[PDB]
Nucleic acid binder design. Sequence first.
DNA 1: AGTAATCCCCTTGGCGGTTAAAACGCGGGGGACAGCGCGTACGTGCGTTTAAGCGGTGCTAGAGCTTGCTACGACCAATTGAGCGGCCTCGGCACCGGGATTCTCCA
DNA 2: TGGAGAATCCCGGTGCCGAGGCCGCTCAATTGGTCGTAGCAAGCTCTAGCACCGCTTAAACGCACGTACGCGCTGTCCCCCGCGTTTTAACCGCCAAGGGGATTACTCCC
Lengths: 74, 630, 73, 80
Amino acid sequence: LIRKLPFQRLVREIAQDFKTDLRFQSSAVMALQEACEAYLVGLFEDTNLCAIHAKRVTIMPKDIQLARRIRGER
Amino acid sequence: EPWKRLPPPTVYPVKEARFEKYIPPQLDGRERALAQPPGQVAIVIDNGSHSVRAGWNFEDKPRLAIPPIMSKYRDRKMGKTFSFAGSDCYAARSHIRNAFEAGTGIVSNWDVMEHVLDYVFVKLGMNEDMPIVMTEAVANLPYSRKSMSEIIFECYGAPSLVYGIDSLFSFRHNQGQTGLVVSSSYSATHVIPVYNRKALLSQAIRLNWGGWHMAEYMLKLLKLKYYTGFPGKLNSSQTEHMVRDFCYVSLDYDRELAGYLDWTGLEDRERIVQYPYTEEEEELARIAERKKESGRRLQEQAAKMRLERLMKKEQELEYYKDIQRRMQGESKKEIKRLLDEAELKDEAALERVIRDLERSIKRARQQRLLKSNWEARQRAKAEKEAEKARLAEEARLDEERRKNDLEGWLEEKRQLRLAKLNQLKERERLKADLGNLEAAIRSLENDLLRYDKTFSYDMTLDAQRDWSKSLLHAFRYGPRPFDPSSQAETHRVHLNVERIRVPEVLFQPAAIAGVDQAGLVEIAGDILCQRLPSLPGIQDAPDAFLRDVFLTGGNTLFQNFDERLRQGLMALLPVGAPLRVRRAQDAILDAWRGAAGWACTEEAKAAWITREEYLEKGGEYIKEHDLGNA
Amino acid sequence: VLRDNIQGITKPAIRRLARRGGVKRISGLIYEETRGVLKVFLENVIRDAVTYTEHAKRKTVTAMDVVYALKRQ
Amino acid sequence: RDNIQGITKPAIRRLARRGGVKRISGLIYEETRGVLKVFLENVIRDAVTYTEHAKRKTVTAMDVVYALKRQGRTLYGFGG
DNA sequence: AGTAATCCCCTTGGCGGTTAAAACGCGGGGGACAGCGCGTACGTGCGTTTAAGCGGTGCTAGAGCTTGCTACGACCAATTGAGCGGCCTCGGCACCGGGATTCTCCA
DNA sequence: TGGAGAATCCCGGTGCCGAGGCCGCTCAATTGGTCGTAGCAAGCTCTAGCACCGCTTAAACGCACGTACGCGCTGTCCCCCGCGTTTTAACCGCCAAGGGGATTACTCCC
Ligand SMILES: Nc1ncnc2c1ncn2[C@@H]1O[C@H](COP(=O)(O)OP(=O)(O)OP(=O)(O)O)[C@@H](O)[C@H]1O
Ligand SMILES: [Mg+2]
């Protein structure tokens, strides 16, 4: 769902904060992407319930923030 | 096999509501209208939720028949507004709205209704004064009567208006003196008792099921049948044409249903509807070579790991044999000490490991080491070669067993097959939870197939798993094999049980679609048996009504609809009751023909409301009369 | 050097991820909120995946290092 | 026996006050009892599993703490 | 070496009372929830352009595997004192009462 | 704004029981030497990770514009709160029991 090359570049860009000139095995990036897509999809499910519960069909930033607050991510 | 014997399937293209041609303003109708005698001309509008039908009272059929829809939009390229109000909308952009509240007989989008009426008067050829007869829902809401009257008198200025009921116009057109009028339309199903040409609307009942609901319900059932995925865009406009073309009423639902998916004869019970699919060596040799080398590399990697496991297991085997060579003629402490170097605990555990390694191995400066590793492969090759010797002679022994004890040998294959199936059952029925042989089974079953005249393929384990022994394949794909590769065999729906399940909602509303209302036979029987004999002004009830149960509206046109209703009512009435069920002639247009014939009679002109009477009384007011609402 | 690549997860990509989560309609402020979510997640996965890589004194991060990092969530 | 009704309305009120709740629908009380016993039916079956596997006919505080810790709700104070 | 009586201990069960907490009644308030109007903000469709994806070429970092040994931890026996179980006490925290300060609500 | 009165705080007094320190001793941590080995180091192999080019077209963006839906507003009514009354069962204490686990006796069997 996310385009592969701009996800590679996002991974590299993040990693440089921890160790310069790391290398990533091709299978390691796909394992990160497949976990991120599965994480975002699974969070949007939980936000959609937060909108629907507030009688809103349209998800809103406070729906992300309620989902994460109850999942204990914040 | 049946699918090899059966003919090629017969397949029907998808139909949908489609535009076909333009029609101009029909100025000859306006000319003829101006030629009529005074007070003998009117415009007749059958305000049907499926079709608005309109024309001149002096003519035998409508000039117009259009869906009560509008489409209006701004062309993003040309920059101008376009507007459409019937089948002139292609049902090219389908920005459609409908005048009626979905699945009901009541007009509620008055902007669409005005556009529909604009199209009606334009195509009838009015350009600037004419009396209007318009059909109306049973027990129609006063607010909708008001809103329709306001449009007719204040937007269009018409001299007089009258409302009547399409069900009752249809009855009077067919000489309806007294009877029970049964109407199934697009929006609804009604039973109205009619006495001395006057409807007893206080005793009428509505079902809330009709030809719209059947199209929607057929759509739900098809989207469920192919829930794993269907490539065509399933629309209820298509399922309406499927309901028209293929559905029929059962004369004995439970007996016809219980056998409907039986593989024998399903060829003639199924009907197949097909959506518009699209039809889709150096290249292969080079690619296959790259595949072949990649496969060879995987084979080498497996064999290299297998050879590592061969050398490991043989070196392990040699160590465990080195223990055994000591343990024979050494103390239990020496047995235990050598076992402790293995961290094993039993001589027979070394025996098991020695054999199990051999049982595994049989399946699969430097020169002294290299050859002794190759000698471990020769120890492996001795197990491998002794495996070859074992199997060849054991098979020859069993071939003698077949010759010499054939029936007992067959009986052995049954006993073994069952025992192996028991282990598979002990695996699977448990592992279906506990997860949270097969070649032996086959080989036994193969010899049983080869020589056991008691055996059959139908008891083969594979036959227990075969698509042609399933039910859901018959439900989804019928008597014939299926593959998702074929673009022609995908993009087709098999209607099967829905041939009969959809009409039967009229008779079994709660059981089949949860409508939570009495079925058609129970509605009609409650009127005939319980209500009309109680109503004190009526004479010769029920019997006078039984002599004409009358079917009206398009959604009655299913095959066997009449005989099903007759046989259902026959069981509710006293023996020898003179029950007749009768169909309207041309059960769709016939409601307009009744309104047109009635339009200018003295009965109608007594019921007409003039513009000035509307201005006096307001739009809720109506002249109560035989064919209209109270 | 790399900068601003979090704008590489486009708004259509966030639509696809939301629709697959069953969402009907999306407030226009979701798109930056989703990035603040994805980045805070992907940082603390990669923090461990790299920690498992400088332990064992190596320089490629492997799929197993990713797997061990996810397993720590 | 139904000592779940011994989790009274005032007690479910007090727990919601500590949870910071101002106003409570009267339907909440039976929902909360249904949620409480589903919690206990997970922790006690594990605390029993420990006493059973450790072959004792009494349930100790540490059986519960292992049960909780394995359920994911680490409790400090009763051993642990 | 076995099986049963004897005896410790610690858990469950019952009885009484006392009083503090749960249940019950009742007025009213204000918060839940359906209804309405608008308006702006999100979904749709089109033309645009941007770069992700694929097939292909080139290099070298470094993952992965083998060889060789010696530095470091496993194992045991003798030594001893750091850490645990039991006893003591006094001072911190609670618990009460009473007058002082705060906050709430109707005027 | 005031006021009345209830509810929350504070100040000093009382007492009880548990926190902090002392004592005896065991046994678990330390000292000393042994020995096996594993993982630290040096070295070779070639996998696969990174870089670049050129092409294709599907995917991303900016914009027009309609209408579906979020939000503040209004009205009601019902139902949950604050407070007085009634009642029941939680808490405490004291006695019983039983059970079970370790120990001790006495015989038979090896
Ligand atoms: N031959 C047919 N067999 C079965 N159903 C049919 C047939 N022809 C038409 N229909 C269906 O019957 C319905 C047409 O009903 P009809 O036109 O009589 O009602 P209407 O006047 O439009 O509706 P209403 O009175 O509910 O507003 C549609 O659902 C149509 O698909
Ligand atoms: Mg009709």
